[PDB]
Amino acid sequence: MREIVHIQAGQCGNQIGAKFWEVISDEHGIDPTGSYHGDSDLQLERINVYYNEATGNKYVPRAILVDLEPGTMDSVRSGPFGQIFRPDNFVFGQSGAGNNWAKGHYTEGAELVDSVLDVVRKESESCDCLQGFQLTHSLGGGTGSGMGTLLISKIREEYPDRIMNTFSVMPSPKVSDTVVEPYNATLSVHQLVENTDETYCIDNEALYDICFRTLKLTTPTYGDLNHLVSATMSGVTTCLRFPGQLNADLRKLAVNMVPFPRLHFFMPGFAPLTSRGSQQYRALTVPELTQQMFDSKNMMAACDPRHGRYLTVAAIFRGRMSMKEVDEQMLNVQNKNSSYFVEWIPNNVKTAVCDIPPRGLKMSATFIGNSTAIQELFKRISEQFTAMFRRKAFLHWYTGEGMDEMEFTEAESNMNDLVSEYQQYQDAT
Amino acid sequence: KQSSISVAVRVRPFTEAESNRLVKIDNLRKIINVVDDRMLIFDPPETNPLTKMQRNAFPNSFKGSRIREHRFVFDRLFDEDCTQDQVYRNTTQPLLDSVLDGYNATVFAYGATGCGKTHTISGTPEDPGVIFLTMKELYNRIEELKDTKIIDISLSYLEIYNETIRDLLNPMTQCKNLVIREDANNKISVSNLSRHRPNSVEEVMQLILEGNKNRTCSPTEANATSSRSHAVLQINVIQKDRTGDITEEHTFATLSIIDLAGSERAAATKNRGARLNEGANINKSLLALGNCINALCDPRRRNHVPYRDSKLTRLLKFSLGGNCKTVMIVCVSPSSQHYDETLNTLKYADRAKEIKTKLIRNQHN
Amino acid sequence: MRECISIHVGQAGVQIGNACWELYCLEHGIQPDGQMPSDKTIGGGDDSFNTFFSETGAGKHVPRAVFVDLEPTVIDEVRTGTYRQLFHPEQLITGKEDAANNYARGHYTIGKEIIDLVLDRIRKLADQCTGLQGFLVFHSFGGGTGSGFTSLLMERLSVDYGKKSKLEFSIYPAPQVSTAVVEPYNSILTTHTTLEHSDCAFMVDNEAIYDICRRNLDIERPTYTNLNRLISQIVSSITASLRFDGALNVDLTEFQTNLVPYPRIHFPLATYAPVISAEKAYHEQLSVAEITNACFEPANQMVKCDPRHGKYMACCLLYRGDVVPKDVNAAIATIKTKRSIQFVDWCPTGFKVGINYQPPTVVPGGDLAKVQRAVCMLSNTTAIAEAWARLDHKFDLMYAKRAFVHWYVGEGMEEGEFSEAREDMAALEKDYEEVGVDSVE
């Protein structure tokens, strides 16, 4: 029985996690009280992947909620599903990290990491077999970046042979939400490349573009962005907890999509996505699902695949459908778009099919891409980083917390090396 | 100015059991024929009379076996009967002369498990290896240069185990506090190493023995004392003049001696659990090293050499990147039972002969 | 008295086994609960033959099968399905984790800690067999379990049971269609470690069966159920001679004797000619000659190759139903006059014939028509060399970059083994090139 321990760090991680637990609890028919009231019997046979049984057929999420600002924890508690979370898994401090990576990694996070790891050890050692961890956080903020990377490092030390799944919100290209975003993002990426098996890069502007352009939403609050991300996170692990014609767990996706150890930053997507009015004009079939799925405008990372080449993509379908259609479509996409796939991997598409669609849909699909275009992310950050690091724009807030300039230089060099590797595999034969 | 990476090959002698089986069968087979100092033949023909008799009436209808031997050329070859002094004189003494002249140098051992790398480098008390001879000759030449130059040695000794760095001369230092950080000029600069200062042969050999005692080692059924870590020894030699007219002629160099853990074959091994996990990490590190060799050889891949795939390749970055004379000691076991692995250890070595580097004399002050 | 043990490895093997045992239960009148109601009419009769089903005192019939997938999902679908009461509860899962499309995991790391249990169950099942003939292993190239654990199991069975026939039904990777990017590595390593242990490997391709379903059966959107039903029909045709009377019987040891000239070329293709819908079952005679001609059409082959690019080394035609030997003789004589169908000079005999009285069953909910005669063909050709070479080229295109190789060395494998496997595959190609050459004297 494969089990996942879910860790939520920072405000962004906590909001995404709250929406995700809403989605998963609805998927398995778990009510806000923790009791089951669903219909299908397939909802219980793999409830152990995310939930533990407590007393009265009450199911408690295997979640660990982490922050340094107490307000997020109160917001989670007072929400619709605040009463299903275990009270002892709410680990939180007093003063935030100050949008400072060093405070959340060395000064403030270091004082709270022990309690979080105690809870992690309690949850992880209470499983027949742990499949891995998944962490939801944000780069470009103090608590999320610092505590998430510290926890990832220490869990990797304790659990070197388990999967690590980082769903992270990266800095956006046009508008920033923190002045010191490049420093935190660079140090976070430096820690992530050495201590994660697969990272799902998310960008807020891509989600805004999807909501406005595809869903025709004019007020896309963070609830809707969390909705989209939550659909993706549910799609990734669908074959772990439902039967299918062709299964695929997290480790299989990591094996098939990571050709080289350091190139494990992915570009997610989800289909179908339609407006409330335009649904009735669209026939939902696999040819339309794959058409929306591979569209550059449906990606969640704000990086155009068409500026690079796909090293490897993975498509996870949900619903009753034929295998011939999926195979023929994943062959036609490669044949027609052969310029956007590396030619030294003969088959760049991993396929998985699950028989249980989402609750209100007859068919769905989740995209996870691995392409060289992701370098356009890192390069941008690197540029901004050096633009601040040449003049030492804000370094006294970090060196004042005990950091050395060698850490900054090493992070910059590592990110530049990653960019160089991606460029090498883009331009190759 | 160019300098090629020299490759010496050493063939270990048979064990007592293997020697007994092979001698009885010959009266099991030796598959490495060392025909010249720079030339060996791998799986030579006409060493199996039954195969000769069968193939003399079987005109290439089917293969069932090798059809043509492999022919290998290296810088120097050592047979089963070589001793430690012959290896030392022709593999690393010029490197010590270079480090005392002002040019960085490294010697490192590679091969399959149980081929005699720790024997070559560390040796045994009754048969000292490369390190003992090198330090002895270094301190002797220091005594020769006394009252003419001032020579300072700084010694560092670490190990790579499961992609974690440990200081062999300062235990209880946490793995979390030993990290590799490249500065603005791409210098390795491992953090929090002891950097000891010996001043005699007795002190340096005692220090090195204490370091060797802290290496990770356990039985794995290939040999009762199997190294499970990549051991790196660095000797910084710094030369000052006694005249008092101190100028840029002040010199400083590094001699590196590296013992690599061996590749474990999967088809023929009985190591289950933590030993297998350690072998997996060792194999990952050696694969990363091989990728670095292939990238350095191929002009088309010069845009990126994957040094960061493992800590071993990062610590070996200085050697292959520039300003260092490199020697590779490739250790092999000459038996049919180890036909497969040996071939790879030869084949990789062949590619490694095509790496070239630029050497610049060091100056200071 | 006669019997054979079926082994189903991986998801593909398990699902093919579901189809196969559904077909067997319908053929022999076994209900899903294991009871045979035909005893209520003919008490003590023999409608359920003990080649596949062991009988207990209560009248329950237990299939002689072993299921393994290193993952609980697929077997758990069986334990809570309609055939939960048929199989013995020892359906084996070491699914605390799967192989993740990794040969090393299913052979070296997680393939252990289940192998002893599986061989213990196989030993227990064989100890009930008074006259075991051989094993039918169902697996797939390209998966983790189906490659690695199948190779390990074949290696152990070759020692435990020695000269005992081991026939394999394997899903070959398609030339174009695939569901994983590491299929070449798994397939090459599997073949390298399996050549010295199997006796005959029957091969099918999902792309070819998709084409067959699209063209002949008028199914635009087939799932794996249709493919598994066709494979089940082929397996039933092969094993019919052990169960029902016939004019010409074929034992399991006959296939390896007739279809395998040399030890290393034991890779025949399988096909099933009268694949037809109920609507198209009318408008045609479906005589012996027509079906035998359909066997040799390249379009109807279930491995995406063309026999016209090579030479036939051996052919085995298994007939079922209302078939007269004179018609089979005339059909094969007609085939031998075609210039498009070449045979190697070192085999002027070519054909083996088997004939059985029992016609195939309808499998309600299926797609095949109720034909009153049918033919299966097992043909060893040199054209399969092409199907090897493509994989080898694909392997090279990855191995030159060492793409995905770290996932394999991270589970205890040495890099050089990859090269060693590829070299063994080169020799295999050359063997085919040496086998299909005109002799001279």
Ligand SMILES: CC(=O)O[C@H]1C(=O)[C@@]2(C)[C@H]([C@H](OC(=O)c3ccccc3)[C@]3(O)C[C@H](OC(=O)[C@H](O)[C@@H](NC(=O)c4ccccc4)c4ccccc4)C(C)=C1C3(C)C)[C@]1(OC(C)=O)CO[C@@H]1C[C@@H]2O
């Ligand atoms: C015709 C009908 O029944 O209404 C649909 C609907 O109109 C559409 C537009 C839905 C609707 O989604 C949205 O309006 C939306 C808004 C912001 C961000 C994302 C979505 C829907 O809300 C979403 C809802 O989806 C689900 O119920 C899925 O199971 C989904 N559930 C949740 O996310 C969920 C949210 C809160 C509480 C509990 C569950 C899911 C998706 C993936 C994985 C697991 C679960 C559905 C079918 C609809 C509405 C209700 C209008 C869509 O939803 C998804 C992501 O499947 C948006 O495009 C799809 C396609 C649908 O046609």
Ligand SMILES: Nc1nc2c(ncn2[C@@H]2O[C@H](COP(=O)(O)OP(=O)(O)OP(=O)(O)O)[C@@H](O)[C@H]2O)c(=O)[nH]1
């Ligand atoms: N014909 C047919 N092929 C199948 C079926 N199920 C899976 N396959 C094929 O099996 C191949 C891969 O095998 P997997 O599905 O991964 O099963 P496996 O060998 O156990 O691999 P793991 O699940 O990783 O252990 C794919 O190419 C599929 O097309 C099936 O029901 N019928």
Ligand SMILES: Nc1nc2c(ncn2[C@@H]2O[C@H](COP(=O)(O)OP(=O)(O)O)[C@@H](O)[C@H]2O)c(=O)[nH]1
């Ligand atoms: N998707 C999503 N992103 C968010 C949300 N709230 C904040 N963010 C992002 O998180 C970043 C701010 O980091 P934050 O978590 O607030 O810092 P912290 O509280 O100190 O950990 C910004 O770049 C925001 O774009 C949210 O509800 N959803």
Ligand SMILES: Nc1ncnc2c1ncn2[C@@H]1O[C@H](COP(=O)(O)OP(=O)(O)O)[C@@H](O)[C@H]1O
């Ligand atoms: N040239 C040699 N002469 C004598 N013994 C040798 C020689 N090479 C290897 N050995 C023997 O092999 C054994 C194990 O070799 P070792 O060097 O530990 O393997 P590895 O190179 O994998 O560390 C030692 O006990 C040593 O005596």
Ligand SMILES: [Mg+2]
């Ligand atoms: Mg050693």
Ligand SMILES: [Mg+2]
């Ligand atoms: Mg499986």
